[PDB]
Every structure is written in C-alpha cells, then in structure tokens.
C-alpha cells in the first residue's frame, strides 16, 4: 500500500479507541475503560493491517471517482478498522485455543499477567465493539444495516470454519482420516477467506451503494479461489520458507502439505505421518519435513502456483455485472507477488 | 408463566435450531445443532419468557395476534441464546464444548434477528439494543475480574459503588433491561424516556435479585462457593464496611481460600457482624423503595408488568 494510504489509515485508530473508551459513555467504571483501551492498543494496531487497508483499496476501486472525497475515504478506513477489530477478536481467541506463545512477534494476549481464560471475555468485547463504531459513523447511511448484517454473518461463518478445523483434532492429536482436500477447502473458505477477502470487498461495495446480491456473489466466486491459493502458499512456506519459524507440523494443523502428503503416501509413508505428525519433539518435525521432500511437495506447489494463477486470471477476465476487473487483478498480484 | 405461554414459547425452539443449522459443511452444522440443543433450551427460561410477558403487557390488546406473540417468543429465544453464550463462557472459565462455541452461540442470535425482524420498524432499535447490552455485559465481566489478582481477591476493590456497577453491567442489563426494552420495541415504543423510566426500576430489582442470591449463597439451605472463589459478593462488601481491624484481618487471611475451614471462618464472621439482620433490613427497605417507584411509574407505562417482575424476585 502507498505511504499516504497507510498514514491516513493509521491516523483513524486513536479516534476509534477514544470512541470506545473515552466518549463520556461509562464514566462510573473508568478502571474498565482504561483496561479496554490497553486491550485494543495491544491487539489491534500493530500488524501489517492488510485487511483494513484492503477495505480502503476496494472502496477506492469500486466507487465513482467523483464520490472519492476525503470524508468517504475516511469512512472506508473506519470500516477497515472494524475488520481489524474482528480479526483481533478472532486471533485473541484462536491463540488461547491453540495455546500459542506468540502472534505477529508479540506474546499472545491470553499469556499476559492476569488474563488467561479472561481472553474469552476480551474476544467477545473486542468483537462487540465494532458495532458501536458502526453506529457512531454509519447509522445515518443506507449501507448501515447491510454492513451490520455482513459482520454478524461473517462472524457466524468464521466460527463454522474454526469448529470444522477443530473436528480435525481429537484430545490434542491430529485425526489424519479427516485430512481431505474437500475438508481443507471448506476450512479455508469459512475460517479465513470470508473475513480476509469477502468482508473487505463487500464492505467497499456497500459503502459505494452496490447492493446487488449477484455482484456480491460474482466477487465471492473469485475471492474464494484467491483465498484458497493464499492459504495454500502460506501452508507451503510454513515448512519450505526461509527464516517467522514454522510450527504447523508440531501443531498438527490440517495444512495443504499434510493433505497432499496423505494423497501421495504409500502405506509406509502414511505410517510416518501417523507416528510423527503433530508431535512436540524437533526430530518428529524434521521426519515430516523430510517426507514432504521425498514426496515432491515443492514441485507439486510450483505446478499448483502456475496452474491456479492461470485459472484465476481466466475467471477474472470472465467477470460481468459491471464489477471492475482491475480490483481482482490487484488482489491477485498482492497474493501471487507477480 | 401460564402453561399456554410456556408451551407456545418452547414450540419455537426447534424452528430456531433448523433456521441456524438446516450446505457444503454438514458435519460442523450438525455439531452446532447439538451445541444449541444441549445448552439453550433446558431449565427455566425466565429471561426469554419475561420478553413475551413484557410484550403482552406493553402492546395494545387489539395487536396481540398469535403471529406477534410468536415474534415476542423469538425475541425471548434471542435473549436465551445470549444467556447460553454467557453460561458457556462461565463453564469454559470454570473448566464437548469448544472455546469458540460461546462466540458462535452469541453471533447466532443476530442471524435469528435478521431472519424474523429485518423488515419491521423495530429492527434497528432491537439490533442496537443487543449490541449495547453485549458491550456493557463484557464491561461488567471485566470489572468483576478487576476484583481478583494472582488468584487472590483484592479486598480494597470490594466497595458498594464497585459492587453495584458489577451487578448493573454484568447482569441487570441483559437479565432485566433487555427483555423489557425488547417488548417495548416490538410494541413500537421507541421513546427514550419510557426506556429510561423502566431502567430505573429494573436496575433496582436487579440489584435486590443479586444481593438476595449473594445472601443465600452463604445462608441458604443446600452448595455456595462464593467465599472459596473470592467473589465480590454483597456479604463480603458489607462485612468490610462493618469490620474493625481484627475482623478485616480475618477477611484478608481467609477470604477466597480453598480450605473448607476458611469458608466456615468467614461464615462465622458474617454471623458475628450481623449480616443476616442487615440483609433483613435491606430486603424490607428495598421492597418499599421499589414498590414506591413502581406506583410512581409514569410516561404511560403499565404498573402491573413491573409488579409482576418484582413479585417473581421477592416472592
Ligand atoms: C472463530 C475463531 C476464533 C476463528 C479463528 C480464525 C483464525 C484466522 C485462526 C488462526 O488459524 P490457525 O490457528 O490455523 O493459524 P495461526 O494461529 O498459526 O495463525
Ligand atoms: Mg487455530
Ligand atoms: Mg492458531
Ligand atoms: Mg500459516
Ligand atoms: Mg501460528
Ligand atoms: Mg450466586
């Protein structure tokens, strides 16, 4: 993203914290409002903010140029921060569920002194807070109700994704019979692609007064295809990228690598996965990495990266109902880095 | 609640489960049906039935159609979905329930609202009420947690002002305000002054409800764990107001400890400090104040609704 777009977006965050903690609403409980400021300051504004900024980009590529006022671009930024509020809520909870040590370079929120399982309340609180932001800045606009309904629906779908991911684990141990490409695809769609890709684009559309369910559906078909590649590349680089140190094997994740390894494995190779996948010992991670190398997963990913890129590019050329192709090409180029 | 009211309310629940669960992801949808079935419809449903009663006592008789009473029942089930999300979060904090099931069950009430209410004039006030009540409930949960540090109760925090705030935010908003404000909105009663007048009485009733509960935790016939858990209970707050330095040291030493003998030491102190007699004086004085405020209720609100709520809490 541009320096001007990044700085404009970052300037909004302190106002959202004031709106949620210092707007003279709850003056009888200052210790709680001061704490919630710290919850927001720790968990919301330190990332790359890809999803927030992408909300602004989407809006700027969907709206008529003559409607792109500083005021409307700031509303897009506020919607972006609501996506970053939802994400913060989801990751606070996922870290507690996964018992992770760090997120985005920082100790996980639940590990901070006197949090622990109180992170569940903080998760609910941060997600609830975005609706207060929506009421303040959007209650007077026609997009208000569609935007509220989109956030609640995406929250419900993301929960289905997280729960489906959990149905791949039994008492801390991966259930390898569950590691199918069909279930993988479903996990990625529900758990990540709705909030990562569909939510920013649909928000841009609503702010631009695009309400045609068919325009949203066309955008969704493409964004779910891009989202699937984004998570597959992420899974690949967890094991094969250059040092973030990847822990997906130890964690027993239903990764694209594990799914494709099980498709390709002879019985001896399947037994290695059963014995060593999702185990804590370093030598068990190395055994799984070595099996991924033996099964040719690097070549497999290289072929998938080229084929998927060509299929998505073809599908974007075929988009209709006046959706701008350049937006979908721009999202592709960010994800494929070409 | 009449047999007819209870039975009509219960008949809605299977529809709500089908609405939310019945797809490319049938194994996780089936699981979510079980999450709902196992956690939402069991036990008394006082908050959801209160929403129906509020609507029936607020609406014009001519508008009380079977169809509108069913809409009130659906709003009551939305309150019960929020209750279930809060009981799940409590079960998770105590401990096939998954940690995200509390978030998922809470999110599901907004899908029910969209389904049944999105075309009605009351829709935005209702969704905004749920949004605000959720935020306030979370603030109250956080304030309760600020009364504990490193596993020990912070007795300097145990003030009546903080106790009243905890009860208001954590409990009374969603238990008492939300059912009545829903009944009002469904009956096209939008006037902020009417909601405010109801709120004054409902927060007083909610305060007595929690104080009675706190009293019975220690003094009721069973099994109460407030003392062992170091809870910011009315008994602990008043004990600290009434204690001399020797009595305060007994609280510092024994409040919030795991040993059964420490719970008996604290119960003995509550007896020594006359907490039972203090509760008797409060129950009589609060009953009189609340009855007075109900008789004074204005802005065209019905007395009988608030008397009914008061009578269920005080018996
Ligand atoms: C309803 C909830 C709480 C959803 C969580 C959403 C999410 C993006 C989880 C992280 O995935 P992960 O655990 O597979 O990977 P990591 O934690 O390593 O990012
Ligand atoms: Mg996870
Ligand atoms: Mg995780
Ligand atoms: Mg990853
Ligand atoms: Mg990780
Ligand atoms: Mg109790």
mmCIF file of C-alpha atoms and ligand atoms in Angstrom, chain A residues 94-95 97-98 103 162 165 191 253, ligand 2:
data_model
loop_
_atom_site.group_PDB
_atom_site.id
_atom_site.type_symbol
_atom_site.label_atom_id
_atom_site.label_comp_id
_atom_site.label_asym_id
_atom_site.label_seq_id
_atom_site.Cartn_x
_atom_site.Cartn_y
_atom_site.Cartn_z
ATOM 1 C CA UNK A 94 -7.544 -18.717 18.484
ATOM 2 C CA UNK A 95 -4.297 -18.182 20.446
ATOM 3 C CA UNK A 97 -7.489 -22.339 21.826
ATOM 4 C CA UNK A 98 -4.048 -23.288 20.266
ATOM 5 C CA UNK A 103 1.316 -13.795 17.432
ATOM 6 C CA UNK A 162 -12.857 -22.689 13.347
ATOM 7 C CA UNK A 165 -10.741 -27.070 11.875
ATOM 8 C CA UNK A 191 -12.266 -19.853 8.739
ATOM 9 C CA UNK A 253 -2.550 -28.479 11.521
HETATM 10 MG MG1 LIG C 2 -6.293 -22.398 15.367
#
